[PDB]
C-alpha cells in the first residue's frame, strides 16, 4: 500500500522537454490532519450575483472612516449599493481614502470626492495668495499618511505632498521631494507603518516624517538603512501582505519573479515553474498585472491577475515549499472572473472583468453564477518497473450535491499526453458514506502519473490517494 | 477521355465497433452532450434530430439504440441522425460498460449543398444566357449584367 | 462463446495474469500481442506433434492472410478454458510476473481433460499372433481351411 | 491541424449482422428510381490516381472484404449525375436502398448555378496572382496579402 | 427545416481493414505525406499531431501503429489524430506489404462539385432567409444584402 | 537521432573505447538509454558521457547494477 | 543497484599526480526532485543571431532612466 500526494504534480512540456510541475487547477490546499493523511484539498468557493452595476470593476478600497466598501465598478462610482458621485475615464484606478474626502485619482489628476457632496481637484495655489507655485504633472498612484495625501509625478523622480488645512493644494512652502539614490521613475507609492514607501524602477526607498516646526524645511527625510535595491514590474504589482509588500521584480534586474520584502532585503517566494510562466509575457503585457490579498478561514492568499494566468499563492499551506495554484472559469483555458475581493460585513464581495455585475462568494456552492466549473488534480511522476496497481482509492466527502456528478481519471506513460478517461461517480446528493475507487489499473511499464478531472457545481473535497502497488 | 467528376460511390452509414477487438456493439447506447461535459446527465445533452429521406427533421430522445450490425437502429435503420454543433460521445455497451469517451467531435454533413449555395452566393442572371432583354429582366433578381 | 478469435485468447490470458483487460487504465502495445500470438502458435504446434500428440480442433494460420490475430480458431468449447490458461502460464516469464498456483492447477486440469478422451480412444488391443490356432469350436473358419489366425500384418 | 485522419475507402457491410457482403452487387441507377432494371441507369467511371477515366459495366462487384473491386485491384467509381444506389447480397436479398446519395442533382443544379450566379473569383485559392487572373472572369478579389516579388 | 443541423453523428474513430479479407489490420504502419508523393520517403512526410483534451497539439513520429481493433493507437491507448487537410495516405501491413495507397484523400469526397463551386463565386448573405439580424451578421462574409426580415 | 559516447577509465587519467548509444529521437517521448554489459572492474573505474548535439540535452540519474 | 552522482566528477592530472575534480562542461545543475533522484542536469541555452553590429563587444549597461 502506497500513498500518492496530489498537492502538486510534476511533469514535462512538449515544447523543450523540461520538467515543469502541474499546479492543482481551481482547488486549494488545507493541512488539517485528516483520517490517514495530513491535509485535504477543497474547491474554491463559487460566485453568486448580488448587485447589478454600471460596468466592469476598476478599483476598490475599504473606507475606514465610514464603514462601507467603495468601488468605481466601471463607468461611475459606487458606495456599497448607493451611487454618490460620477467618475470619468476608462482603465484601472488607484484609490486612497481619507477623513474628509474619498479620492479616486483617475487619468493624470487627483480627482477627490467629498462627503459633503462636492468634487474637487488638486491644483497649484492661486497666484494672488503668494505661495511657492510648484510644477505639478501627471499622477500615477495615491496614498495617505497622517492627515495628508501623497502622489508621484509620472515619469520623474519627484513625488509631491498635500497641505493640511486645505487638502486640495500641494502645500504652503515644502512639497517637492525626490527619491534619487538611482535615476529611476517612481512606478508606485505606498505607506507602511508611518513610512512612505516609494517604489522605484530599480530601488525601494523609505521616507519617514520629522518634526519641522519651520517654514519649508524637510518635512520628510529619506531613510537609507531600509533600501531594498529591487524595483517593481508594474504600477499595481504591490499589496499589503503579511507585514511587507510582496511585489513583482522589474525587468531591470536579472529576471521577473515574485518576492517578499524582509527587514532590508527581498526574499523570493516563487518556484522556477512560476517564473517560467511569468517570463512568457512580454514587458508591456506584464505591466498590466494586478495583485491582491484575500484571507478567509485560516488561509492567506496572494492573487496575481496576469493577462492569461490567475496564479494564487497560499501562505498558510506552504509548510514544505511554496504552494501555488491557478484558477480558471471555462471548461477550456480561460482567465478567472472576479477582479477585486473585499470583506464587507460578514461576506466577501468579488468584482468582475467581463460583465457589468458584482457578486459575492458562497461556500456551499462551487459554481460561478449558474455555470458548472472544472477542477483538476495531478499526481507526480513515479518510476516503478513491471509493477501492477489495482486499488486506487481517493477519499471524498459527499452529501451537499444536486446530482450524482462523475469523475474522470487517466494515466500517462510519457508524462505529456493522457490515456482513456474513466467515469466514476464521486458525489451523491444525500449519501454521506460512500467509497470512490477503481478496482484495476494494470501494469505500468516504465512510469505512470494520474489525473483527477472533476466537473461540478457543488463543493468538491478529496483527501488521500492510495494504490496497492503489487 | 476526361469527363467531369461530381459524385463518388460511398457508403453513407457509420458502424460503431468495440475497442480492443473487432466486434460490433450489440445493443449499446450513444449519449450526445456538450464539449467537455458528461453526456449522461440530462443537463448536458443537446437536441438530436432525425434526417428523413426527404428534407425533414424529427426530434427523438437522446439515448440512441444500436443493432447487431453496429449501426444505429431506432425501429429500422435510421438516417444520419444529424445534430448541431460539436458534441462529446460516450458510447456504452449492452451491460452498461463504457466502451469509449471522446471530448471534441465535429463532422459536417456532406449532403444538401443546394440550400447552402442558395443561401451563400450572389444573384446575377447576366445577359449572354438569355436571348432577349425582357425575358432576362423577368428572371433577374437583385442584379443584372451585360455582354 | 465470445472467445472466437486468437486475439480473444491472448486478451483472456492477459486479463488472467492481471496485466491488462477492458477495465484497465493502461494497455499493452500491439507488438506484444503479436509476440503472444506467435508464442500461442508455437505452443499449439508443439502439442500436436503432427497428429501423434494431443489432438484438438485447431487451424494454423496461412501467411497468405496477413493478420494472424483476427482469424478464428477451430477450438471446441471445452478446450478454451485450458488453452488460454496454459498461454497465460507461458507468457508470465515474458514479463516479470509469475503465475499464481491456481492458474497452474487449472492448466494441469485442462491438459488432462484435453488428453483423456484421446487416451481412451487410443487404448486398443492388438490382434492374435500369427501362430495361434483356432479351436474346433468355430466349425466354419475351421471348415474353410483357415485354421490359423492371419496375424498382425 | 484541421481534419481528422480517417480511412476514406468505402466498406459495405450487412444491416442486421456484422458481415462483409461477400460477392455482392451494387447498382448505380437514375435519381429516385429503381436501378435493377436495365431501363434507367447512368454510366459509371473509374477514376485512377493520375486522373484517367474508364467505362464500366452496370453490375459493380464487391470484394470479399466489402470494397468495390474491378478486375483484380481496388478501384474508385465516379458518376457524373446524381444517382440512387441499391446494394444486393449474393443470394439476391436487399441490404440497403438509397433514393438520393445527395439530395440535389449536381448536373442540373450546376447548369442553373452557372446561369444565376456571379462569375467572380478570389485570390486566396490561387497561389500566384497571374494564375488567378488567368482563370478569373467578371471580377477578382485580392483576398490574401500577395507579395510583390 | 427544423434547424440547420449541419453535423452528422458518425464513428469518431477510423477503422482500417484488410483488402483481400475482412479482418482489422494488426500492427500495421500508416504513412502520411504530401499530395501525389510517396509517404515512405521521410522527405515527403508532413507533421502529425495528437489532440489531447486540453487542445494542445503534440507532434509524434510519422509511422502510426494500428491495434487489433483497427484503430490508430499510441502506446496502447487510442488517440485522436489531426493533420492539415490534403495528405496522401499509405497503409502498410505488419509483414511489409502494401494494403492501400491513396494519392489525395480529398478526392474520396461524396460531393466534389462543391470544391469547384466554392472557387468561382462570391458569398453574400441575404437578410430574407435568416430570422434575425445578428444571425445573418455572424455568418456574413464579404458584404450583405438588405431584404425583408 | 543524436548519439551519446560513453567510456571508462581504469587509472582515472586516460579513457578506453568510446561506445555509441543514441540518447534522443526527434519525436519519441519515451525511450530507454542504457548499456547492457560493462564488465569486470579490476581496481577502480570512472565514466564519461560525451554528447554532441544541437538540441536540448537532459540527463538525470545514472545507476549501475554493481553485481 | 548503486546510483552514481554526475553533478561533479573526481579525477587526477598527469602533470603532478594530484587529485583534481572534473567540472561538468557546458551543462548546468538544477535540483528539482526528479522521479527517483534529487536534481537533473540541463544543457546551457543556445545562442541565435539577432542583430548585426559594428564590432566585437566592449561594454554593456542597462540604462534605468530610459
Author numbering:
A (entry chain f): 3 to 472
B (entry chain O): 2 to 148
C (entry chain r): 1 to 153
D (entry chain T): 6 to 154
E (entry chain Y): 2 to 150
F (entry chain a): 406 to 472
G (entry chain a): 3 to 68
Quote what the paper states about this structure.
In the mature virion, the portal–tail complex is present at a unique vertex inside the DNA-filled capsid. The portal has a canonical 12-fold structure that is formed by 12 copies of the 725-residue portal protein gp1 arranged around a central tunnel. Further local reconstruction of the portal by applying 12-fold symmetry yielded the structure of the portal at a resolution of 3.2 Å, which was identical to those previously reported structures of the portal in the P22 mature virion including a lower resolution helical barrel structure, flexible tunnel loop, N-terminal, and top regions in the wing (residues 1–5, 422–442, and 480–487, respectively). The C-terminal helical barrel domain (residues 601–725) appeared unstructured. Structural comparison of the procapsid and mature virion portals revealed major differences in the following domains: (1) the top region of the wing domain, which interacted with the SP complex (described below); (2) the stem and clip domains, which likely interacted with the terminase complex motor during DNA packaging; and (3) the helical barrel domain, which was absent in the procapsid.
Tailed double-stranded DNA (dsDNA) bacteriophages and their eukaryotic counterparts, such as herpesviruses, possess a dodecameric portal at a unique vertex of the capsid; this portal serves as a channel for DNA packaging during viral assembly and delivery. The portal interacts with multiple copies of a scaffolding protein (SP) to form a nucleation complex, which initiates the assembly of the major capsid protein (i.e., coat protein) and other minor proteins into a procapsid.
